[PDB]
From a paper:
[name] and Imp4, bound to [name], are buried inside the structure. [name] also contacts the WD domain of Utp1 and a few surrounding unassigned α-helices that extend to Krr1.
Within 90S, the pre-rRNA is cleaved at sites A0 and A1 in the 5' ETS and site A2 in the ITS1, yielding a 20S pre-rRNA intermediate. The fully assembled 90S contains an unprocessed pre-18S rRNA, U3 snoRNA, approximately 51 assembly factors and 18 r-proteins with a molecular mass of 5.0 megadaltons.
Author numbering:
A (entry chain A): 28 to 162
B (entry chain B): 28 to 161
C (entry chain U): 428 to 454
D (entry chain V): 428 to 459
Write the structure that this text describes.
Amino acid sequence: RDTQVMRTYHIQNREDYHKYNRICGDIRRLANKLSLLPPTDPFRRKHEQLLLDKLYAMGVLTTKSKISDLENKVTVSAICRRRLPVIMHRLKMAETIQDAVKFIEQGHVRVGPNLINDPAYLVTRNMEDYVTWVD
Amino acid sequence: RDTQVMRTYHIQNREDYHKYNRICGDIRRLANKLSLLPPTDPFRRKHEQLLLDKLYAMGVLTTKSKISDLENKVTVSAICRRRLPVIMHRLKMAETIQDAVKFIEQGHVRVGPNLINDPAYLVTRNMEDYVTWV
Amino acid sequence: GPLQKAHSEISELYANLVYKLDVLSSV
Amino acid sequence: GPLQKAHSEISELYANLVYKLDVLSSVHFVPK
């Protein structure tokens, strides 16, 4: 499960995978508790929408979702696709994810105003248009 | 104090001031409690750094600081200065904050990829280079 | 009472989630 | 250990601060 996911996104820490997995479990548990609130509770609609909007802002949900959609759409992979080298590859800035890891590690890459040299940096939706070369 | 902060920064509700004031008190209480952990406690060091990094990323802190600086540098006004109208005025994009409020509410302003029409929106450090006309 | 406790539990879990994602997308 | 209660409070107070700031810099976006 992991080694495949870690393979397709060129993740070398087994620990990165376990953090993303716990976050998926966190979101699941949070949606379950929200769904167990009284449906007459205005807190439930509001905090369900807070969680949805947050996952949009992270780019973890790329499509309009309901709370029931979260089991399908919220996966370790959806988080992995947010890592800076995978983003770079999708933007065509690097031929391969492995080349993007090297570009990032060697200091060639900037997101917004910041030099990022950590390939585990997750690119939010606000930032995904602002990946640039330092050169 | 509430009335004067609102006037300086053209805030039209009384509640944004209290939101910012509680946040300033959250930061002070958090910094006091961190200082009560042992100086050698790695948790304290990690969480002091995270807190400093967060206030830098918000632009609330504009200069390299330490936890002992938080008492002074973290004010309601330092938060107010992050509101989109104030940021625009400081960038010279509007002659006045009131002008900026209008540009914003009328849909003329984008921050990063998003149209922002709420003058209470806070511009993080990441976003402040990316306020553009529509 | 029970409703406030249910709300507080959700607020702590969501804040913790916001915190975890924030650490991953910040320098 | 003996610092667990004080650590766990700081963890909770900080995650709440991060949430409070996050809300003030938030937009309304829905993808397609």
